[PDB]
Symmetry: C2
Subunit: 219 residues, 2 copies
RNA sequence: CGCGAAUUCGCG
RNA sequence: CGCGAAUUCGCG
RNA sequence: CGCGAAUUCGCG
RNA sequence: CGCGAAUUCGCG
């Protein structure tokens, strides 16, 4: 009966229960009816609900000031934040031990793609219920100026957490002429190394740090 | 009928605030205090939604795999220009001299709809409908029949087979990721110039790389 | 131009 | 293989 | 692309 | 066995 518990937590009641459930079903539970298709529509939806809220309550309206914020606002970390409010995780139907933050976030999106559709695709209405429940935390995030931590910083905290050691960004080359230069640095921790390329030294490093983070997720 | 009214007619909507429509039309290089920078930001997320809700709904295959490719194209600037010309708005953009390219047009396309959205008093359902009413048919066509991607490898295949009488050579650089979702990074060389390209297949990668090598060769 | 081929690329 | 493009060669 | 196969990997 | 991502080979 958890079906009619999450609804009384959203402030809406699905006229089509199968749809709601579907947006909560992971492919590893029903290969024929999972939230994949919905997550796709949810992403587009929620992004619009946020951006409209960002260009509206932001102290600065220049793209260069909004982009950085939006990155956070539509980031997985944040969707889990909002999803957490709904206690969403304990409402997902998935095989024991496969659930994570990426799935939650996904489900969170597909959830609203569900409401939107189940209400006859009433953008305006679906948007309101979204704010009713989340507008506050969004305006707070924007006020606080929350932003996505850069890769170089993330890599450092990761490698320091594990091996109490920082990375080392050795410079290996430069191609393009003074007009349009291209750097190639080697990010390295222990014996793992990735390569980054970009306009400036810092830029390249970020590239390398990002790729090196991936390389460290499986190890 | 003035420019605005002449467009508002093709648009199928008349703003209850001319100022707003202006803002979504002028370019920074015409008004530093009142351009469309902020409106384009909003219009992008807005237009994205309209197009995606339409995609997922009428697209045959509704798989994450197939949809993504489409979506990219449907929101691609080259594709917006086609929608843009349907309104031939590239005649109402308030910009100075020749600086206007097929990017300032798409951006104005977005911003416009944001203006239509805001003006309607933030009426999504309305603005959305007005949108479909003018581009629904087009999008669907683009969706159904599918896309016809650019053959960068062959077009470049000549740019060099003539400008140098020699064909370009492609050299693989590195592959990564799980063996069920690999990421190829190949290199494209021509005479003395070189560029890279990423993708999920040696070909798609050679296509991405062959691309830059063109939008760089015609630079020197 | 038409026919028949070689080579490269892409599409089906 | 078919089809299309580019370079090339041969015949008409 | 079509047909016939080999290999690696993910899913059922 | 079956579905999907990738890399090759033969035939059309």
């Amino acid at each position: 009966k958890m079906l009619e518990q999450l609804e009384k937590k959203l402030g809406y009641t699905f006229k089509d229960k199968s749809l709601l459930e579907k947006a909560l079903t992971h492919v590893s539970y029903s290969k024929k009816e999972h939230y994949e298709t919905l997550e796709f529509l949810g992403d587009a939806l929620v992004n619009f609900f946020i951006v409209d809220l960002l260009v509206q309550y932001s102290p600065n309206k220049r793209e260069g000031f909004l982009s950085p914020l939006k990155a956070y606002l539509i980031s997985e970390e944040f969707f889990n934040l909002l999803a957490q409010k709904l206690e969403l995780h304990k409402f997902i139907r998935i095989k024991r031990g496969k659930i994570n933050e990426t799935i939650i976030g996904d489900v969170f999106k597909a959830l609203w793609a569900a409401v939107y559709i189940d209400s006859g695709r009433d953008a305006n209405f679906t948007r309101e219920l979204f704010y009713k429940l989340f507008k506050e935390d969004i305006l707070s995030a924007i006020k606080e100026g929350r932003v996505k931590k850069d890769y170089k910083t993330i890599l450092q905290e990761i490698t320091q957490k594990r091996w109490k050691e920082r990375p080392e960004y050795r410079l290996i080359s430069v191609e393009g002429p003074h007009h349009k230069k291209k750097f190639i640095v080697e990010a390295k921790i222990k014996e793992y190394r990735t390569l980054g390329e970009g306009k400036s030294k810092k830029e390249a490093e970020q590239r390398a740090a990002e790729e090196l983070i991936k390389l460290l997720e499986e190890s």
